[PDB]
Design an enzyme around this catalytic site. Structure first.
Site, PDB file in Angstrom:
ATOM      1  N   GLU A 238      41.422  52.249  20.397  1.00  0.00           N
ATOM      2  CA  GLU A 238      42.841  52.456  20.137  1.00  0.00           C
ATOM      3  C   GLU A 238      43.699  51.206  20.365  1.00  0.00           C
ATOM      4  O   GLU A 238      43.464  50.459  21.318  1.00  0.00           O
ATOM      5  CB  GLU A 238      43.307  53.567  21.110  1.00  0.00           C
ATOM      6  CG  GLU A 238      44.799  53.578  21.399  1.00  0.00           C
ATOM      7  CD  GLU A 238      45.313  54.591  22.390  1.00  0.00           C
ATOM      8  OE1 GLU A 238      44.655  55.642  22.571  1.00  0.00           O
ATOM      9  OE2 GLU A 238      46.423  54.361  22.925  1.00  0.00           O
ATOM     10  N   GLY A 256      41.505  64.272  22.324  1.00  0.00           N
ATOM     11  CA  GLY A 256      40.511  65.193  21.793  1.00  0.00           C
ATOM     12  C   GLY A 256      39.282  64.407  21.416  1.00  0.00           C
ATOM     13  O   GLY A 256      39.396  63.303  20.880  1.00  0.00           O
ATOM     14  N   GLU A 283      46.635  69.527  22.845  1.00  0.00           N
ATOM     15  CA  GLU A 283      46.611  68.288  23.589  1.00  0.00           C
ATOM     16  C   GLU A 283      46.965  67.096  22.773  1.00  0.00           C
ATOM     17  O   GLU A 283      47.606  66.225  23.244  1.00  0.00           O
ATOM     18  CB  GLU A 283      45.258  68.067  24.263  1.00  0.00           C
ATOM     19  CG  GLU A 283      45.006  69.035  25.400  1.00  0.00           C
ATOM     20  CD  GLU A 283      46.132  69.124  26.432  1.00  0.00           C
ATOM     21  OE1 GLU A 283      46.733  68.118  26.810  1.00  0.00           O
ATOM     22  OE2 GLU A 283      46.416  70.230  26.842  1.00  0.00           O
ATOM     23  N   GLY A 405      35.716  57.864  31.088  1.00  0.00           N
ATOM     24  CA  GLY A 405      36.450  59.002  31.628  1.00  0.00           C
ATOM     25  C   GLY A 405      36.557  60.176  30.687  1.00  0.00           C
ATOM     26  O   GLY A 405      35.975  60.189  29.600  1.00  0.00           O
ATOM     27  N   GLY A 407      39.442  63.677  29.753  1.00  0.00           N
ATOM     28  CA  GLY A 407      40.741  64.301  29.929  1.00  0.00           C
ATOM     29  C   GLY A 407      40.576  65.617  30.641  1.00  0.00           C
ATOM     30  O   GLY A 407      39.853  66.497  30.166  1.00  0.00           O
ATOM     31  N   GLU A 420      30.875  64.881  28.665  1.00  0.00           N
ATOM     32  CA  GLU A 420      31.805  64.137  27.813  1.00  0.00           C
ATOM     33  C   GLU A 420      31.741  62.666  28.190  1.00  0.00           C
ATOM     34  O   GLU A 420      31.758  61.820  27.295  1.00  0.00           O
ATOM     35  CB  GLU A 420      33.250  64.646  27.949  1.00  0.00           C
TER      36      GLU A 420
HETATM   37  C1  LIG Z   1      39.279  57.812  28.509  1.00  0.00           C
HETATM   38  C2  LIG Z   1      38.169  57.726  27.711  1.00  0.00           C
HETATM   39  O1  LIG Z   1      38.199  58.158  26.452  1.00  0.00           O
HETATM   40  C3  LIG Z   1      39.118  58.897  25.829  1.00  0.00           C
HETATM   41  C4  LIG Z   1      39.662  58.418  24.663  1.00  0.00           C
HETATM   42  C5  LIG Z   1      40.576  59.168  23.950  1.00  0.00           C
HETATM   43  C6  LIG Z   1      40.939  60.415  24.367  1.00  0.00           C
HETATM   44  C7  LIG Z   1      40.391  60.932  25.505  1.00  0.00           C
HETATM   45  C8  LIG Z   1      40.808  62.335  25.953  1.00  0.00           C
HETATM   46  O2  LIG Z   1      40.251  62.820  26.920  1.00  0.00           O
HETATM   47  O3  LIG Z   1      41.585  62.942  25.229  1.00  0.00           O
HETATM   48  C9  LIG Z   1      39.448  60.159  26.229  1.00  0.00           C
HETATM   49  O4  LIG Z   1      38.922  60.622  27.323  1.00  0.00           O
HETATM   50  C10 LIG Z   1      37.026  56.684  28.032  1.00  0.00           C
HETATM   51  O5  LIG Z   1      36.421  56.302  27.064  1.00  0.00           O
HETATM   52  O6  LIG Z   1      36.897  56.224  29.135  1.00  0.00           O
END
Ligand SMILES: C=C(Oc1cccc(C(=O)O)c1O)C(=O)O
Length: 436
Positions: A238, A256, A283, A405, A407, A420
């Protein structure tokens, strides 16, 4: 300002990473490789370094360190130091920590002394690689000779990768997820992104790993760096902020996730699930609303719009719902103010922001540093390009690690959240080239 025709059967990503490996090693210099819209920009050597810490601002040039105390917005301190660098050179490059975005939400006092906020440098030389050609900016004889040697040698074959175990939970991610779930159920906040580090028990070859993983990913931006004792690489999913010379500001919020790269029909089922799932739609909508509110803080009244709403963005091992938010930079604002307004990304922090960012201090391993911060490219014409630092590997000291991480919302389950993180780590885990 000087060009070399791009060779026949050579991919730009492979040649850019090889130049970063071979050329910078022969001269023993730091560098940052940034991929932005078909161009791989290798910022080679450090002409001057801006080091913004929680308690001090330092500018380092030709052996001389000038120290300054700073107050107020970290963005104003960094902006002033970077604009100075840009009077001399056309472009500056670096990284901005997650910790840079905490001041806006009243958390400055939570930062330990000497906490890094940003590292931004003026390169001595820039080598721009595209499908079209190789362009040289201020390359000296020694660098030009090293480049010609690289082109004659050709690119190295990438060896077989070495696997890493992501199944263990030494930092108690499952435990920390349960705490956040309890806090959300109590009404403390809506969503928080919590993460876990994964130790890579062997040294990796950053340029070769970058090359291998790039063949298997479709990021908006990518980077490979060796800077001030940090090695890092990433395939950014992003743009947290882009400010163009014409005043146009863009942010690309993601929210998402479903797995990708599991097979065509499997990936389509997951894609159809993501686009119709009430939990994911809610979300994403909430995140786009939050993101619009932030961009409103720095835009010309009524210039903010959602130009792409809730579309599937494919990112290697995962696919997300994404939107694009565009605005016009207000004359009373500037590029750093825009970065601060959109920082830390809502995607990798929480909602509401102040409560979510504070929960990260209590529930995640802090300081996050590069992870969930940004990799930046700034231009003298006012340009700012800031890639969200996710899907990245790091080496600091004798330690190599990955970080991912997820969400966390009221309905979240520790097991599925842990799974995830495995999906996101899979953007890199199959492509780790051991250092030889
Ligand atoms: C935060 C991470 O990735 C994410 C990217 C975009 C959205 C989310 C979310 O949960 O909606 C997400 O967790 C990571 O790659 O450490």
């Amino acid at each position: 300002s000087s060009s070399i025709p791009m060779p026949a059967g050579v991919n730009p990503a492979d040649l850019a990473a090889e130049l970063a490996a071979v050329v910078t090693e022969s001269v023993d210099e730091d560098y940052l490789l940034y991929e932005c819209d078909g161009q791989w920009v290798l910022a080679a050597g450090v002409q001057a370094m801006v080091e913004l810490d929680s308690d001090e601002l330092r500018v380092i040039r030709d052996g001389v360190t000038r120290r300054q105390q700073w107050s107020g917005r970290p963005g104003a301190a960094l902006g002033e130091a970077v604009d100075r660098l840009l009077l001399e050179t056309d472009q500056a490059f670096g990284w901005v920590a997650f910790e840079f975005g905490v001041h806006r939400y009243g958390l400055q006092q939570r930062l330990a002394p000497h906490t890094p906020l940003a590292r931004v440098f003026s390169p001595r030389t820039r080598i721009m690689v595209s499908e079209k050609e190789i362009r040289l900016f201020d390359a000296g004889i020694r660098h030009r000779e090293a480049i010609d040697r690289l082109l004659a040698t050709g690119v190295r074959e990438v060896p077989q990768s070495r696997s890493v175990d992501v199944s263990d939970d030494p930092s108690g991610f499952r435990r920390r997820v349960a705490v956040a779930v309890d806090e959300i159920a109590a009404g403390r906040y809506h969503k928080v992104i919590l993460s876990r580090c994964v130790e890579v028990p062997f040294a990796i070859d950053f340029p070769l790993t970058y090359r291998l993983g790039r063949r298997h990913n479709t990021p908006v931006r990518s980077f490979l760096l060796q800077l001030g004792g940090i090695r890092a690489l990433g395939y950014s999913p992003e743009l947290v902020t882009a400010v163009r010379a014409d005043g146009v500001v863009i942010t690309e919020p993601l929210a998402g996730t479903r797995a990708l790269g599991r097979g065509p029909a499997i990936d389509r089922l997951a894609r159809d699930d993501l686009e119709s799932n009430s939990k994911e739609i809610v979300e994403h909508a909430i995140s786009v609303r939050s993101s619009l509110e932030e961009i409103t803080d720095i835009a010309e009244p009524g210039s903010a719009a959602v130009i792409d709403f809730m579309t599937v963005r494919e990112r290697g091992s995962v696919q997300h719902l994404g939107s694009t938010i565009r605005a016009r930079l207000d004359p009373s604002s500037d590029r750093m103010a825009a970065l601060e307004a959109l920082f830390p990304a809502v995607t990798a922090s929480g909602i509401p922001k102040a409560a979510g960012v504070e929960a990260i201090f209590r529930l995640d391993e802090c300081p996050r540093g590069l992870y969930s911060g940004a990799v930046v490219m700034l231009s003298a014409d006012g340009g700012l390009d800031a890639a969200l630092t996710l899907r990245a590997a790091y080496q600091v000291g004798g330690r190599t690690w990955l970080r991912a991480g997820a969400g966390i919302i009221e309905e979240s389950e520790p097991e599925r959240e842990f799974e995830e993180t495995c999906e996101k780590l899979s953007t890199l885990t199959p492509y780790l080239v051991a250092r030889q």
